[PDB]
Amino acid sequence: ALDVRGGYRSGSHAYETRLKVSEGWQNGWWASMESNTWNTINDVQVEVNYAIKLDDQWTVRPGMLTHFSSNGTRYGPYVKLSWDATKDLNFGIRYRYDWKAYRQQDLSGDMSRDNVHRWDGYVTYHINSDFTFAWQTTLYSKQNDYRYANHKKWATENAFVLQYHMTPDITPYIEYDYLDRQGVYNGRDNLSENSYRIGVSFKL
Numbered sequence: 618a619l620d621v622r623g624g625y626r627s628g629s630h631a632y633e634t635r636l637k638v639s640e641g642w643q644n645g646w647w648a649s650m651e652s653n654t655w656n657t658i659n660d661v662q663v664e665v666n667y668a669i670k671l672d673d674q675w676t677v678r679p680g681m682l683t684h685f686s687s688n689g690t691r692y693g694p695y696v697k698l699s700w701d702a703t704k705d706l707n708f709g710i711r712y713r714y715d716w717k718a719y720r721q722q723d724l725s726g727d728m729s730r731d732n733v734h735r736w737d738g739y740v741t742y743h744i745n746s747d748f749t750f751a752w753q754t755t756l757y758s759k760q761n762d763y764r765y766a767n768h769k770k771w772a773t774e775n776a777f778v779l780q781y782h783m784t785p786d787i788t789p790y791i792e793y794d795y796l797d798r799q800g801v802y803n804g805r806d807n808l809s810e811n812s813y814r815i816g817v818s819f820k821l
């Protein structure tokens with residue numbers, strides 16, 4: 618599947634575009650590659666996991682998200698648990714440890730590693746043949762002496778996605794995210810970060 622997404626961030630006063638290609642294999646392997654651009658008025662991420670079928674409803678996915686930026690490489694081993702409660706309702710939970718392969722100045726001025734503990738919760742609800750609603754909730758916290766742009770050692774994200782199944786292989790969507798007070802505009806941080814996004818996913 619190919620996903621193209623454009624987004625506006627209200628606190629950062631910035632536009633971002635994501636181009637993403639993802640595929641599940643019948644042997645259980647799954648992978649994704651994406652690029653994200655950032656235009657104030659950049660990253661590449663590779664994700665791989667393996668789907669362990671516990672039964673017809675339950676799947677465990679050991680995986681890793683590798684994140685490439687100009688600062689360097691960040692490795693995010695994870696485990697995701699997925700439950701298809703019904704054909705129309707799926708729940709998911711993931712814990713990921715984001716470990717930076719590069720050292721950065723911490724809040725005390727010492728060189729350390731800005732590693733992160735990250736949890737995501739997922740609910741996907743196929744409302745009817747036309748629409749699917751998905752919510753992803755996220756909590757991450759710092760392992761070491763660093764902070765987020767909200768002046769805390771932790772922050773949240775909440776992503777709300779409405780997908781319209783126009784075609785069986787074309788799915789336009791709209792999305793609203795609240796990314797905590799993590800907006801940064803001209804060195805000034807602690808801004809409310811609303812995120813408004815529109816995209817479309819294309820199946821083969």
Ligand SMILES: CCCCCCCC
Pocket residue numbers: 694695696712713714
């Ligand atoms: C899923 C990998 C677990 C890594 C946790 C490390 C905590 C210091």
Ligand SMILES: CCCCCCCC
Pocket residue numbers: 700708709710738739740752753754
């Ligand atoms: C068994 C996983 C529960 C997922 C919680 C959903 C939070 C949006």
Ligand SMILES: CCCCCCCC
Pocket residue numbers: 742744750
């Ligand atoms: C179609 C009306 C029910 C949809 C609400 C469920 C959560 C988005």
Ligand SMILES: CCCCCCCC
Pocket residue numbers: 752
């Ligand atoms: C079912 C949608 C949940 C919305 C949560 C909003 C949290 C402030």
